[PDB]
Design a protein around this ligand. Sequence first.
Ligand SMILES: Nc1ncnc2c1ncn2[C@@H]1O[C@H](COP(=O)(O)O)[C@@H](O)[C@H]1O
Ligand SMILES: O=C(O)Cc1c[nH]c2ccccc12
Length: 573
Amino acid sequence: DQKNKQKLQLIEELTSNADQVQRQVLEEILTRNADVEYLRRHDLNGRTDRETFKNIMPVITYEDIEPEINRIANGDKSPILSSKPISEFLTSSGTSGGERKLMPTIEEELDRRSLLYSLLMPVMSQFVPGLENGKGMYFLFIKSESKTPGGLPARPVLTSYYKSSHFKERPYDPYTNYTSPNETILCSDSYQSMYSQMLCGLCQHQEVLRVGAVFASGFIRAIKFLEKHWIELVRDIRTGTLSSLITDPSVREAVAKILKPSPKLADFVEFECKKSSWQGIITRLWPNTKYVDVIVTGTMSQYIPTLDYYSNGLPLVCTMYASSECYFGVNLRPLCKPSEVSYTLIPSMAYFEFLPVHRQQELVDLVDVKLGQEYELVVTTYAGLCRYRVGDLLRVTGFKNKAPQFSFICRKNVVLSIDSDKTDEVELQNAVKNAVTHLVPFDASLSEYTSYADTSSIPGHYVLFWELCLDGNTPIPPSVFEDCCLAVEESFNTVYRQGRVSDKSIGPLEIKIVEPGTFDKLMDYAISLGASINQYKTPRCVKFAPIIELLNSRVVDSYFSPKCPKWVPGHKQ
Ligand SMILES: Nc1ncnc2c1ncn2[C@@H]1O[C@H](COP(=O)(O)O)[C@@H](O)[C@H]1O
Ligand SMILES: O=C(O)Cc1c[nH]c2ccccc12
């Protein structure tokens, strides 16, 4: 019987009693945090009931509780948001004033993250058999850490999770037996982390029954890493000796238990990697792979054709929906189509509310959301976030017993995204305005521009299309356009700049100069589909393949900066 059946029954119990669980969660939070400064400031006066909470407590954004956050981050240890000690800040990919948002968490929250993860394979065991008889090849990575002036860790939620006893000291689980040893995941050197993970995956290739990464982008980068380094990898496999470039002793102690001299495997890997076409290479190097486990909902959907290419059309699986401030839900139907993914929110994670979005107690509870209606996700967490707006838009597609299921629509205001980076229109506009100052000495200027997330390169990069207006009589040298590139990048927020400098999840920004009349063609094309002259601006971003092919066909010159933007871990202040 055991675990799977119990976990599946737990899902039944939680979703059949969703409203009661939601109530018990809110009651527990307000009872614990009854005396914290934030609740007392709003005069909640020790009350714990739903009606009081919804009538009294305001619906907030990050900027609303930043003074509380800063105070805690500066070392104020009084109960301001939470009665249990804030153990760390989980730095979100979402920003504020260019800097990562600091999400308070408490130690207890790891239990709830682990509960969520423990649901995944029992759910999957209903759709794909035999996964306990083999391994999963996942490429998992830690990121830069930082510390608040008061001494609290500030780091991404997965970096926090991987380094915790819940992952680093976890027991052997046959349904989640990874090819990557903990030492290779927890390696601070990102090159060594990637190389050793790729090697271990190759060494255990016949046992691999599934592959992936947290994000589509992450898995694509691992494939590209093999494209560049397979010769070194084949040499390691052939001789049974790990590359001396791997200097980390914990790494390589771990590899040494896995790596054995095997010219037969080396010949096999060489054979496949030598081939000019890498179409379907996943199903050749790892022939027992049943699916690809990566997020391809949200902006990550742009990577579907790339994964399909390398996998020869294996099923793409989206298992979960979660964030820094709170873990949310699970896909109860993982082998569905990527366009039909819905996430069932787990009612014991947090108190969930929903702000209706239309094309006086305003909020609607989890069980009262309406089929087909769009909402903004609003959360009340154990660490003291009260009715915080996530910025995620969701649509109800159905119900699991009493618990609703949501397709993910978007994170609000995201224009450009390659990996976890999110660039909005204001950021983009500001960035382009800082870069055009470089065209002033040449008495040139920008007439019009647009952008796209270029996925043809690994890692992806931002592309800007620039149509200039030249009034002077001196050509602009490549060095100045390269200055323009860098200037754009320097104006982007810290997550973008971290992706460029530290995580290598983003390639150099490219500016493509297009010939005169190019954006005229765009408009003409934009009217043949969708034809509103009155309401027409050249869009800040484009995404439709024929439009992009049109713009690329009219490129006169392109430029990247050889330089990287500034980046320093932690908040500016
Ligand atoms: N499965 C998913 N599909 C689409 N977007 C997601 C998914 N999981 C997380 N996200 C987005 O990433 C955010 C979490 O980012 P972070 O706070 O940095 O972990 C969420 O609030 C969503 O906007
Ligand atoms: O930065 C990280 O690695 C944590 C993270 C960022 N976006 C996420 C979405 C799903 C679960 C974890 C994360």
